[PDB]
Amino acid sequence: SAVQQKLAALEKSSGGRLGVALIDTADNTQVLYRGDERFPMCSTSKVMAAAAVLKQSETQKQLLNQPVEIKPADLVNYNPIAEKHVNGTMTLAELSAAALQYSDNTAMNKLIAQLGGPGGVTAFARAIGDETFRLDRTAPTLNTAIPGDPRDTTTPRAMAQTLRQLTLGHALGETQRAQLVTWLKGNTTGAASIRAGLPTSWTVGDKTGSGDYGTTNDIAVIWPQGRAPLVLVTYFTQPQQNAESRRDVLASAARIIAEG
Numbered sequence: 001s002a003v004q005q006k007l008a009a010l011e012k013s014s015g016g017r018l019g020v021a022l023i024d025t026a027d028n029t030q031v032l033y034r035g036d037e038r039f040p041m042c043s044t045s046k047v048m049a050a051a052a053v054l055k056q057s058e059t060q061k062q063l064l065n066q067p068v069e070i071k072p073a074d075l076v077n078y079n080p081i082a083e084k085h086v087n088g089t090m091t092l093a094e095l096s097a098a099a100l101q102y103s104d105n106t107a108m109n110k111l112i113a114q115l116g117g118p119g120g121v122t123a124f125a126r127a128i129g130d131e132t133f134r135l136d137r138t139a140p141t142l143n144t145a146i147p148g149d150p151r152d153t154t155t156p157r158a159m160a161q162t163l164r165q166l167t168l169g170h171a172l173g174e175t176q177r178a179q180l181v182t183w184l185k186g187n188t189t190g191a192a193s194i195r196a197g198l199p200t201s202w203t204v205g206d207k208t209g210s211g212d213y214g215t216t217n218d219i220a221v222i223w224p225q226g227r228a229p230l231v232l233v234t235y236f237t238q239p240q241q242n243a244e245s246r247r248d249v250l251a252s253a254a255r256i257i258a259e260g
């Protein structure tokens with residue numbers, strides 16, 4: 001096609017490996033680039049953990065109000081919000097918001113513990129029809145992003161289809177869906193990623209990720225005004241273990257996608 005030529009040229013100019021999946025819900029048409037290759041999800045897997053807790057709250061009506069202790073031993077590499085409530089408590093709602101909007105790794109580990117381990121997160125993916133998503137580790141070691149390692153990976157095609165069913169489809173309840181959409185719209189980490197390549201008039205809910213090997217990820221659901229929504233997944237990884245993050249590549253991929 002044409003978008004695929006520019007995405008291929010962008011990837012060639014970056015020195016790394018790019019994965020992109022677009023779903024246009026108007027005709028259920030898809031644009032993919034390496035859409036069936038595995039990529040390290042890094043923190044974009046937090047959307048699946050928050051959605052799995054939300055699915056539990058459909059039965060446990062007061063689940064999101066349940067307090068959870070934050071103890072000093074719970075503290076890991078990056079904890080912007082849970083650092084503030086050490087030796088205190090946080091509800092599951094505020095942990096889900098910390099995980100999605102600030103990418104708090106302690107908050108993610110509390111979501112994983114609430115689901116009974118990483119296998120509880122993968123189980124929820126399979127229950128909604130995602131046979132590709134696999135979460136094996138807690139944070140931060142899920143961000144190792146080793147080339148060829150299948151752990152904590154997915155493909156862009158599967159992630160785009162899953163994010164659509166969670167935020168646009170009916171894989172969740174209506175109250176649960178709207179709460180996740182509200183959370184993703186309030187993300188604070190994605191200004192330089194997919195958001196930077198889209199028209200300002202567009203409202204975006206997204207979750208970013210990053211890890212070793214210069215892994216730089218972003219998944220997003222886009223609402224253009226007067227237009228049916230879109231789902232966009234951009235994954236990027238590099239050959240150097242110490243490589244710097246390349247959020248500019250995700251913006252460029254999004255800009256290429258938005259043009260056509």
Ligand SMILES: *C(=O)[C@@H](NC(=O)[C@H](N)c1ccccc1)[C@@H]1N[C@@H](C(=O)O)C(C)(C)S1
Pocket residue numbers: 042043044077078102103104105140143189208209210211212
């Ligand atoms: C998931 O992607 C998380 N990433 C990490 O914990 C990495 N080990 C890390 C990379 C760089 C600096 C600190 C930790 C969290 N989500 C990232 C993101 O959304 O970009 C993060 C850097 C905010 S941490």
